[PDB]
């Protein structure tokens, strides 16, 4: 049950004025594509706070990648779901190397140890952590660690299932997408199929939908392994196959996954929110 | 659980090409605004058929308005949810005056008799028919009868909660909206609030959300009656108050509720789907 919003004063949306004329802001299956200027964060914050929403964030820091945690977490504290309940789940082979990061109120961090080792992340999120997540959070956000938050990443992303447009391919035609092209792989997508090329570095949704996605990808990856084939971009290839056949209910623009060193700051990006760190 | 979509061949959505540049296609709370050119109906039909979706349509034909049923129903057969399961619920004081309309396969019609008499419709939909609808349909669409379908009205509208932009006010600023302006009414909206002016003639959603809306509006109307006040536009005033405080998850453009005699055929309308009949 959703309680009433309070009175709010904000600019009237005008039907004969688009928010953005330079970009596609809705997919052909009526999922919003999230760009700056398409959302009033005050309305969304109200909606999600009234439901006491808890967001889980998963991040893996195995071997040398523990070095990325300090900046990742400190910048998440500045920019990720501020004002909402957040539970970080840090998966690592070196619990002692997790930096002690000071958290805002209503935010917690759990260190989950994994064995020293694509397959792990999908497997961990689905198989081992299924019951944990269902009991503890409403939404799960699953990201790469070699990243930093530079600007707002908030409840505008939340939805049953989302993927993020890969920053190198948002202007590409589908035949150029680096999907798995061998019919022998479960991740196979022919050249006349595909909506978008989604990056494996940032996906999420409700706990139920994320567990469905990660279970399906893990099962498909096991089939490929049994058949002696490894998809060209590993987990990302399977994620793309899944999101082709199970359309996401929001799509995040490349504001949410950018590499400024590689790609600069094009006119179409009003904000660079979550960005690659040198590695 | 949602099964996989089959392989489909359709045009690739292009991120740097908007579907429509002349209109707002998403609200500030990230609800799609449904216009022609924003949706691929083949994808949506697949999604909804894979769930074996059943759509209920409610229509009231009391006193002289039974005359509108023949055209309403015959044109619904041509244009409304064709290929999907449909259950019409015709509420009338004259069951014998309901025309015998030939239905396509997978479509049924129930005649519900009501006593000879705003309050009735919200009351009937919520109070009397609650259990019926929950058992029989997935979505409810609630419309006026003095109307005809001229073009496709399909599963693109389906969502937990929708309203429809009133055709006379989609270009108006909020201070001009004919909301109830007396603070003594439950339907009161001050001049600095409001997103859109929604028409009472076409709303819907999941059965649960429609029952919530109609219950809330009926309760608010009873409060007003007890206080000796009748909102300026009756049920429509209350519907507007509800949708201000409970944001719809889709908004239908005025393609879905048009009066051509009054308003012609402006450039912004590529299709006139559901239109007023002279009365
Ligand atoms: O030794 C390692 C290697 C990887 N990781 C984790 O795995 C993530 C992915 O590896 P990374 O080296 O960041 O791969 P990238 O080349 O930056 O990213 C590509 O490969 C990833 C893994 O397949 C996908 O998530 C991305 O979408 C795709 O762009 C890292 O961020 C870490 O969270 C570790 O923890 N330790
Ligand atoms: O004697 C009547 C009068 C009304 N109705 C039903 O009620 C509906 C609404 O009445 P109508 O005469 O169509 O009102 P309109 O002036 O066309 O519509 C305005 O009033 C309606 C009722 O308040 C709202 O649904 C609309 O949004 C608003 O534009 C009709 O279509 C019928 O379904 C009857 O069945 N018999
Ligand atoms: C210099 C590296 C050029 C990489 C350009 C394309 O990005 C790569 O795309 C692959 C799929 O085709 C896969 O997602 C890996 C991805 O490379 C990652 O992401 C880029 C944006 C860079 O941050 C790169 O360093 C990183 O490895
Ligand atoms: C000639 C009548 C002019 C009506 C213009 C405005 O529409 C009216 O708006 C009211 C709220 O301000 C309320 O919704 C009734 C609505 O009138 C109905 O809808 C119009 C589009 C016409 O079809 C009209 O005949 C009908 O009564
Ligand atoms: Mn990375
Ligand atoms: Mn009418």
From Swiss-Prot, chains A, B:
Keywords: Blood group antigen, Glycoprotein, Glycosyltransferase, Golgi apparatus, Manganese, Membrane, Metal-binding, Secreted, Signal-anchor, Transferase, Transmembrane, Transmembrane helix. Binds 1 Mn(2+) ion per subunit. An alpha-L-fucosyl-(1->2)-beta-D-galactosyl derivative binds at residues 166, 178, 236, 259. Changing residue 147 to R: In allele Bel01; loss of manganese binding and reduced catalytic activity. Changing residue 279 to M: In allele Bw08. The keyword Repeat does not apply. It is a single-pass type II membrane protein. It catalyses: an alpha-L-fucosyl-(1->2)-beta-D-galactosyl derivative + UDP-N-acetyl-alpha-D-galactosamine = an N-acetyl-alpha-D-galactosaminyl-(1->3)-[alpha-L-fucosyl-(1->2)]-beta-D-galactosyl derivative + UDP + H(+); an alpha-L-fucosyl-(1->2)-beta-D-galactosyl derivative + UDP-alpha-D-galactose = an alpha-D-galactosyl-(1->3)-[alpha-L-fucosyl-(1->2)]-beta-D-galactosyl derivative + UDP + H(+). One of its GO terms (molecular function) is glycoprotein-fucosylgalactoside alpha-N-acetylgalactosaminyltransferase activity. Mn(2+) binds at residues 144, 146. The keyword Magnesium does not apply. One of its GO terms (cellular component) is extracellular region. Pathway: Protein modification; protein glycosylation. It is found in: Golgi apparatus, Golgi stack membrane; Secreted. The active site is at residue 236. Its cofactor is Mn(2+). Changing residue 224 to N: In allele B104. The conserved DXD motif is involved in cofactor binding. The manganese ion interacts with the beta-phosphate group of UDP and may also have a role in catalysis. This is Histo-blood group ABO system transferase. The gene is ABO. The chain holds residues 64 to 346 of 354 of the full protein.
